[PDB]
Amino acid sequence: AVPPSLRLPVIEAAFPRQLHPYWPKLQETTRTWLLEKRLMPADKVEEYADGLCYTDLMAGYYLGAPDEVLQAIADYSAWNFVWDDRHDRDIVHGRAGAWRRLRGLLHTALDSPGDHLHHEDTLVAGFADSVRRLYAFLPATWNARFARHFHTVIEAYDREFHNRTRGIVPGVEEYLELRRLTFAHWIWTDLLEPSSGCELPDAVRKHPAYRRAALLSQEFAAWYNDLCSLPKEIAGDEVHNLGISLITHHSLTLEEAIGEVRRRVEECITEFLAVERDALRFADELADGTVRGKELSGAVRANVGNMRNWFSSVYWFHHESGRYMVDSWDDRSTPPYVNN
Ligand SMILES: CC[N+](CC)(CC)Cc1ccccc1
Numbered sequence: 001a002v003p004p005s006l007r008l009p010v011i012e013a014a015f016p017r018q019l020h021p022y023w024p025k026l027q028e029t030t031r032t033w034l035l036e037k038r039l040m041p042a043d044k045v046e047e048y049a050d051g052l053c054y055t056d057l058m059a060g061y062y063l064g065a066p067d068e069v070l071q072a073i074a075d076y077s078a079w080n081f082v083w084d085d086r087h088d089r090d091i092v093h094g095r096a097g098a099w100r101r102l103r104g105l106l107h108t109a110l111d112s113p114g115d116h117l118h119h120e121d122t123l124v125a126g127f128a129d130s131v132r133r134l135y136a137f138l139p140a141t142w143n144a145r146f147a148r149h150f151h152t153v154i155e156a157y158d159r160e161f162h163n164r165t166r167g168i169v170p171g172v173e174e175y176l177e178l179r180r181l182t183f184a185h186w187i188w189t190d191l192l193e194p195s196s197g198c199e200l201p202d203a204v205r206k207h208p209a210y211r212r213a214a215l216l217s218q219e220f221a222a223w224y225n226d227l228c229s230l231p232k233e234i235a236g237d238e239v240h241n242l243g244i245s246l247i248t249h250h251s252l253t254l255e256e257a258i259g260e261v262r263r264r265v266e267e268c269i270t271e272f273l274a275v276e277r278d279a280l281r282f283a284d285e286l287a288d289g290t291v292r293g294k295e296l297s298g299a300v301r302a303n304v305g306n307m308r309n310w311f312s313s314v315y316w317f318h319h320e321s322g323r324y325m326v327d328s329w330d331d332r333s334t335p336p337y338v339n340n
């Protein structure tokens with residue numbers, strides 16, 4: 001039963017949820033992986049990991065992924081959550097030296113993950129391990145694009161650090177720019193490709209319908225998050241939230257900001273439904289009747305299919321995950337699953 005303030009009837013009806021069959025194993029393996037890489041304390045894993053629904057999130061998004069591809073993606077994704085928490089704790093404690101070191105450690109590991117599998121900072125070693133596996137699925141051109149995209153994500157996270165320490169709550173249009181990167185829009189978009197086991201030629205993946213569909217899928221997810229994480233983020237002195245920068249710069253009140261964010265989240269859905277028809281038409285014309293044609297077609301179709309799936313996974317993840325249940329924390333500014 002979703003709060004009316006967060007309820008989106010169109011998702012509930014027109015976007016039926018999906019679940020990868022490897023999910024049950026995925027849940028236990030990724031949990032073990034957080035345990036053995038020491039990414040979270042053992043007693044925080046035992047009592048919170050599964051309840052975080054990190055693996056559920058991805059198993060409802062990357063449908064059709066080879067099991068090991070999914071595993072790589074879920075370990076990486078769960079690492080990303082821990083990184084968000086560490087980034088957040090570096091800010092709350094003003095660990096700028098620590099943050100900056102980590103930052104540079106990450107840029108380096110990204111280009112050279114083998115060399116960092118056993119780095120003393122467990123957060124890095126954990127990064128290097130998932131990244132190393134992600135690079136084993138596709139040609140080095142895909143790997144280079146991922147690194148080029150994730151290099152931008154680290155820097156976006158750096159800008160966030162400069163904003164929170166100062167106090168700068170970005171402008172709405174500025175936030176819209178920053179959010180496509182802090183949410184890692186283009187990472188999730190790249191990982192569509194190993195999930196369907198094909199590196200899409202630029203001509204294919206930059207087709208305007210593929211591009212807009214991909215964009216729209218990611219705007220929904222990110223803006224839904226801001227909507228749903230807004231209470232926990234307010235409590236933790238976040239400044240990075242569409243809700244937040246609407247209040248601050250447009251003098252909308254709480255209930256006015258939430259409404260404008262909701263309206264923008266709904267337009268994503270209906271814009272997605274329009275371009276989805278186009279994306280699928282394209283897939284259907286790729287199939288020129290050659291073996292390569294069938295391959296591109298099937299891969300684009302699957303990717304658009306998973307772009308659609310993201311809507312439902314993200315939606316339900318925000319209501320099933322302990323990550324956002326701030327109303328249950330002894331200290332609302334400090335989530336229990338976080339190392340403080
Ligand atoms: C994992 C993606 N997420 C979780 C709500 C939306 C589906 C936001 C996110 C992006 C990047 C890092 C951490 C969280």
Ligand SMILES: [Mg+2]
Nearest residue numbers: 084085088238
């Ligand atoms: Mg966060």
Ligand SMILES: [Mg+2]
Nearest residue numbers: 084182183240
């Ligand atoms: Mg963040």
Ligand SMILES: [Mg+2]
Nearest residue numbers: 225226229233
């Ligand atoms: Mg958030």
